[PDB]
């Protein structure tokens, strides 16, 4: 189906001494494959998926060179933003940046992204057309003017539409054994009595990939959202994901209730019964 490559960058200033803590991570879909951490000893971009270890030393030197430049840009930015927002040197502040590209099932460019946040708030974001900017406030508007004058968007556009997609296609090939594989959820249902008249049915989805999934309950073939609880999809820690959804039912009426599971690893939606 569709695929994406995304990079996430976080810089946190450290008042009192030294440079910001900088952490960069890269993903293909829901799989992390590289990292950089300023606090680590190597000071290299490091592999985090087996299939990227295929890449040779020129890859790692280049990613290292580029990610250190990203780190220095963020360092300067934290100083600039402190100025724009009239903040003191006493507090810790955070810049976050995310960019990347989505492709559809044909692996052709679908969407690009490049956005920035300061202290957890929208600062500036490239618009869907990759030609203009959304500046959240007047500080960001100053950055927008600067980036318009220097034609930043046109250069981002070239990466997001071109280079980014090429990288993604290369990674999808080298990592084909896992990146192009779908893991359908392993499902089952559990039952818990809370009282002599009330029971909880819990529908589990385990070991699935990618993370995107839908669990829904029906009573007598109709959608039921009342008296249901659904947890946020969570990482198992082995690369796959977990989720469950529960409904409270009158004891003895369990058979009315069905759990419905949608996942791209499932040719057809799955139905579970107690």
């Amino acid at each position: 189906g569709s695929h994406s490559m995304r990079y996430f960058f976080t810089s946190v200033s450290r008042p009192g001494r030294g440079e910001p803590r900088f952490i960069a991570v890269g993903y293909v879909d829901d799989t992390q494959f590289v990292r950089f951490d300023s606090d680590a000893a190597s000071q290299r971009m490091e592999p985090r998926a087996p299939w990227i270890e295929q890449e040779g030393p020129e890859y790692w030197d280049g990613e290292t060179r580029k990610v250190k430049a990203h780190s220095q840009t963020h360092r300067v930015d934290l100083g600039t933003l402190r100025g724009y927002y009239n903040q003191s040197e006493a507090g810790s502040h955070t810049v976050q940046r995310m960019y990347g590209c989505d492709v559809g099932s044909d692996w052709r460019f679908l969407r690009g992204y490049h956005q920035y946040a300061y202290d957890g708030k929208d600062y500036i974001a490239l618009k869907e057309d990759l030609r203009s900017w959304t500046a959240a406030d007047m500080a960001a508007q100053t950055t927008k003017h600067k980036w318009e004058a220097a034609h930043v968007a046109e250069q981002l556009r070239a990466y997001l539409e071109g280079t980014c997609v090429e990288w993604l296609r290369r990674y999808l090939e080298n990592g084909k054994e896992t990146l192009q594989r779908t893991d359908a959820p392993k499902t089952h249902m559990t039952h818990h009595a809370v009282s002599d008249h009330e029971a909880t049915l819990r529908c589990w989805a385990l070991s699935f990939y990618p993370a995107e999934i839908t669990l829904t309950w029906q009573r007598d073939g109709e959608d039921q959202t009342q008296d249901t609880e659904l947890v946020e999809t969570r990482p198992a820690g082995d690369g796959t994901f977990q989720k469950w959804v529960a409904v409270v039912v009158p004891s003895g009426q369990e058979q009315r209730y069905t759990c419905h599971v949608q996942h791209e690893g499932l040719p057809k939606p799955l139905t579970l019964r107690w």
Partner: peptide, 9 residues
């Protein structure tokens, strides 16, 4: 692969 060039805000 990440961006070759970055820009300060």
């Amino acid at each position: 692969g990440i961006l070759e060039f970055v820009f300060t805000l």
